[PDB]
Design a protein around this nucleic acid. Structure first.
Ligand SMILES: [Mg+2]
Ligand SMILES: [Mg+2]
Ligand SMILES: [Mg+2]
Length: 430
DNA sequence: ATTTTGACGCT
């Protein structure tokens, strides 16, 4: 009891831009605003592959990883914006630059960890301490939390969505003990006030709306963020965890959506995160390894210690192209031309990175796939990156892969290549 | 024939 650590030491937020690439295109083209629309890359094969979907289009069943032609079957009025194509390939620069806009706003409020192009974790512990001092024991008004849900409320003894939201927030604020500055529930509540202000700043200064989760760690913040989308934020308190986890499929927790979570389900014969509490830490370690076992033992109790890392910039700058079916590169000239295209985009992005961020990549990673291999990568080789020169980088990549050609013939490349990937890594200050 | 990314853990 008195020594049971409860994982209530931090306030952590996860901010997730709503249907991000779609909003970028809708800001640029007002005709797309408030319409079923999607972002598609390429157009020739089946109308293009959808990679982002507005909530209006999601209502028709349109999803990511859908061909545009099939999406149009579900949603005949679906509007489409195409990813830019440069040097023969999709180019995501517009979305990377929009991401920078949002990340730089978030960084004015607190230390952020860039988790993906459209999401960042925020460590709000210190900001919450400061705001609690500025308030002077003053109660927190519902008006400070106009888009916040309290997960698990209302409970106990209106039929509209905003009405339920307000009833739950009222119950929460009515229970709060605002005079105890060390109360974790109060700390989370102030965190949510700050996140309201952060999301308001993002929308005012970029036009982009986002959702957010506020809790005591990254996994719960991420889970909370998805509970009320779009354009809303959700507070998941420590006390809400038992009910929340009692019917939460294991695959919904970050890192359990794949083979490990499937093994948890199969080996333990359970379905819901909360069912994990009935195993000892040693039992979970025995099935899933020392680190996974300890992590699961604490996580099913709502506890995790993974820090919000101070990293606003990506650690790698990469570019890749698949060559599916019959487009597979079967000649040396082909391989060299496409290595050059990838290397030129990489050089452009690298030079911009060096100017903006005072750093230089030192390693070039080359990865290829050969036809007939279920693995995403068939071969991954590194070499030195000493000069931001596209021709040199393409030559080096060719040098490190050229012995993969099993063909005895001079030009022909066998087996044909279905993927090329150049990645700049190992940055150093400059 | 989703494609094009990005981070991290294992050995
Ligand atoms: Mg996201
Ligand atoms: Mg998103
Ligand atoms: Mg998504």
């Amino acid at each position: 009891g008195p020594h049971m650590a409860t994982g209530q030491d931090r306030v952590v937020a996860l901010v997730d831009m709503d249907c991000f690439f779609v909003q970028v295109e809708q800001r640029q083209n007002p005709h797309l605003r408030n319409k079923p629309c999607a972002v598609v890359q390429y157009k020739s094969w089946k109308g293009g592959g959808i990679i982002a979907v507005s909530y209006e289009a999601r209502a028709f069943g349109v999803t990511r990883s859908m061909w545009a032609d099939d999406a149009k079957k579900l949603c005949p009025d679906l509007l489409l914006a195409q990813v830019r194509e440069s040097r023969g390939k999709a180019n995501l620069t517009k979305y990377r630059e929009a991401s920078v806009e949002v990340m730089e706003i978030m960084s004015r409020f607190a230390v952020i960890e860039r988790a993906a192009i459209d999401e960042a974790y925020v460590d709000l512990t210190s900001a919450v301490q400061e705001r609690l001092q500025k308030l002077q024991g003053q109660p927190i008004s519902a008006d400070l939390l106009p888009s916040t849900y309290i997960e698990g409320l209302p409970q106990g003894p209106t039929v509209q969505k905003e009405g339920m939201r307000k009833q739950g927030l009222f119950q929460w604020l009515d229970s709060l003990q605002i005079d105890n500055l060390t109360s974790p529930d109060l700390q989370l509540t102030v965190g949510a006030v700050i996140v309201e202000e952060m999301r308001a700043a993002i929308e005012r200064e970029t036009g982009f709306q986002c959702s957010a989760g506020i809790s005591h760690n990254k996994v719960l913040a991420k889970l909370a963020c998805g509970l009320n989308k779009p354009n809303r934020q959700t507070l998941v308190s420590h006390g809400s965890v038992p009910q929340l986890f009692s019917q939460m499929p294991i695959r919904k927790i970050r890192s359990l959506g794949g083979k490990l979570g499937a093994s948890v389900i199969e080996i333990l014969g359970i379905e819901y995160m909360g069912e994990l509490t009935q195993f000892t830490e040693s039992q979970l370690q025995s099935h899933f390894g020392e680190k996974n076992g300890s992590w699961l033992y604490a996580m099913c109790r709502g506890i995790e210690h993974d820090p919000v890392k101070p990293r606003q910039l990506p650690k790698t700058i990469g570019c890749s192209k698949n060559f599916p079916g019959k487009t597979a590169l079967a000649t040396r000239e082909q391989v060299q031309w496409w290595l050059l295209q990838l290397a030129q985009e990489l050089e452009e992005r690298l030079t911009k990175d060096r100017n903006d961020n005072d750093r230089v990549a030192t390693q070039l990673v080359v990865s290829i796939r050969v036809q007939g291999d279920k693995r995403l990568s068939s071969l991954r080789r590194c070499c030195a990156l000493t000069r931001y020169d596209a021709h040199k980088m393409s030559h080096d990549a060719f040098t490190v892969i050229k012995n993969c050609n099993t063909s005895g013939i001079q030009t022909e490349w066998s087996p044909p290549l279905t993927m090329l990937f150049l990645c700049a890594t190992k940055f150093s200050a400059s």
